[PDB]
Design a protein around this nucleic acid. Structure first.
Length: 505
DNA sequence: CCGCA
């Protein structure tokens, strides 16, 4: 035929993974814009989604919120399909300090960037493999909404492949520079005519120096700021991005959508706010604003067919989706934990009671508390009762020590950080379940409750004086989820057992 | 997490 996906993995889809793959692979072909996978912390997800890719045969973009997370999605995917195109398009700066300017302290910070080649390599390999074959999975960070050169001009200038994504022809360069001088003479009159003589001197000096640099030696530092003039697109243009280097029938998989979609949304507003101060003071031309990441409007506007993957799918996902695609049943047959809501009335005494019993049956406990000194005031309080305890303000080793048994309890505050799916954790205690907050949001609770779903004796305790709506939802949702899981195990004769794992040195 | 010496 041409190019197509070859799944590799020593297991078929079990759980309700098949049900989900069907419902998704369908909605895609059935011509559905958005789709939300509502899988449970500890189900198929990656395998489920790998299958949705290897049936529809589309070039896919996997967008993760953080890099560690992208590195695993890739790692796996570049092992799930060891004979296909799997790419890693993320930021390529070991260190980066954008050109800024603190107006109060009159502090112009300069641009300081430390490139990393190994990642730069992978970025070209992503954009170049995207034009060569039509079976490709690119695991991307949020840098995929940031600016890149027009994709026609990319391949429309190719022998074997360009070593830069922003390669502007020299008939253009000549015309562009003139357009820059012309903008400069305009801004300078505007500034100078509103009394901002100082700010016009700053601008004239920086821009003329760059303009010369360009004329002399084809480019200059901070060349980015002139990107639009160089691409000779009119003011206000929407940047070309990695999304544009994809076919029109490409797939988007936003992993951890409830945290990724917003991150991806916010980017633009942060950039503009800094650029605007530079523009306002003469550090830059107004056109520097057209060198930027996409607005979320522009991002959704470039989407072909997207699939939001989340245990706690956020508002946006649901609002623009035909219900969801639940994926509750775990291959292990494990259930969402059982939750108990108990008085704060001498809770710290009670909590020490339950933790004894966990140590007795060789089991671990995680505790979240709403504040940093509240936790410190617990860690000691548990040491008071002689209990091997930890605390989270190398770090991968303290959790590794937990699983091994150095510590019996691990106190924290945001247990939501990655690295806390210990299968040894039989108890998760949520202090201040009712005291409003982010970590006591309907979704934050549900995630934290999830930190009990690895162990077959998982149990959640919520310490509160009142039941909030938040509590009530997570509690009611978890109930429904355990009920469904428990009814499936009856049917398939499953007896849930903790997922066997170990740790290395 | 982002960023065209």
């Amino acid at each position: 035929v041409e190019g197509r996906f070859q799944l590799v993995a020593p297991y078929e889809p079990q759980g309700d993974q098949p049900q989900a793959i069907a419902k998704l692979v369908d909605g895609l072909r059935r011509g559905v814009k958005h789709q939300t996978l509502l899988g449970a912390t500890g189900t198929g997800k990656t395998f489920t989604i790998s299958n949705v890719i290897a049936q529809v045969n589309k070039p896919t973009l996997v967008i993760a919120h953080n890099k560690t997370l992208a590195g695993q999605l890739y790692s796996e995917l570049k092992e799930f399909f060891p004979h296909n195109a799997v790419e890693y398009f993320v930021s390529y700066y070991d260190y980066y300090q954008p050109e800024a300017y603190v107006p109060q302290t009159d502090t112009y910070i300069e641009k300081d960037a430390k490139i990393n080649d190994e990642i730069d390599k992978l970025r070209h390999s992503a954009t170049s493999a995207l034009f060569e074959r039509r079976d490709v999975i690119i695991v991307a960070s949020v840098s995929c909404i940031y600016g890149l050169g027009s994709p026609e001009e990319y391949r429309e200038l190719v022998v074997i492949f360009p070593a830069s994504h922003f390669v502007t022809r020299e008939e253009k360069m000549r015309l562009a520079i003139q357009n820059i001088e012309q903008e400069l003479e305009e801004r300078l009159a505007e500034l100078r005519a509103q009394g901002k003589l100082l700010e016009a001197q700053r601008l004239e000096q920086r821009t003329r120096y760059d303009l010369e640099m360009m004329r002399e030696m084809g480019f200059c530092s901070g060349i980015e700021n002139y990107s639009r003039h160089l691409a000779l697109r009119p003011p206000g243009s929407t940047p070309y991005t990695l999304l544009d280097y994809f076919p029109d029938d490409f797939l988007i998989i936003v992993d951890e959508s409830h945290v990724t979609l917003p991150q991806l949304r916010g980017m633009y507003n942060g950039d503009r706010a800094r650029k605007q101060v530079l523009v306002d003071h003469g550090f830059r031309l107004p056109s520097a604003l057209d060198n930027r990441p996409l607005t979320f409007e522009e991002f959704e506007q470039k989407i072909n067919q997207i699939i939001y993957v989340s245990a706690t799918p956020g508002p946006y996902e649901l609002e623009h989706s035909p219900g969801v695609v639940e994926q509750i049943i775990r291959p292990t047959g494990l259930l969402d934990p059982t939750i108990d809501v108990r008085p704060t009335k001498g809770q710290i005494d009670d909590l020490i009671g339950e933790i004894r019993e966990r140590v007795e049956r060789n089991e671990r406990t995680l505790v979240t508390t709403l504040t940093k000194k509240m936790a410190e005031d617990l860690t000691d309080y548990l040491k008071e009762a002689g209990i091997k305890v930890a605390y989270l303000h190398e770090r991968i080793e303290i959790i590794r020590d937990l699983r091994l048994g150095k510590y019996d309890v691990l106190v924290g505050i945001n247990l939501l950080r990655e690295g806390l799916d210990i299968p040894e954790v039989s108890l998760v205690a949520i202090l201040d379940a009712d005291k409003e907050g982010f970590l006591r949001s309907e979704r934050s609770l549900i995630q934290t409750i999830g930190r009990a779903a690895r162990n077959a004796n998982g149990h959640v305790i919520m310490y509160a004086d009142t039941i909030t709506k938040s509590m009530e939802i997570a509690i009611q949702e978890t109930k429904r989820r355990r009920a469904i899981q428990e009814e499936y195990n009856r049917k398939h004769g499953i007896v849930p057992r903790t997922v066997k794992k170990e740790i290395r040195d």
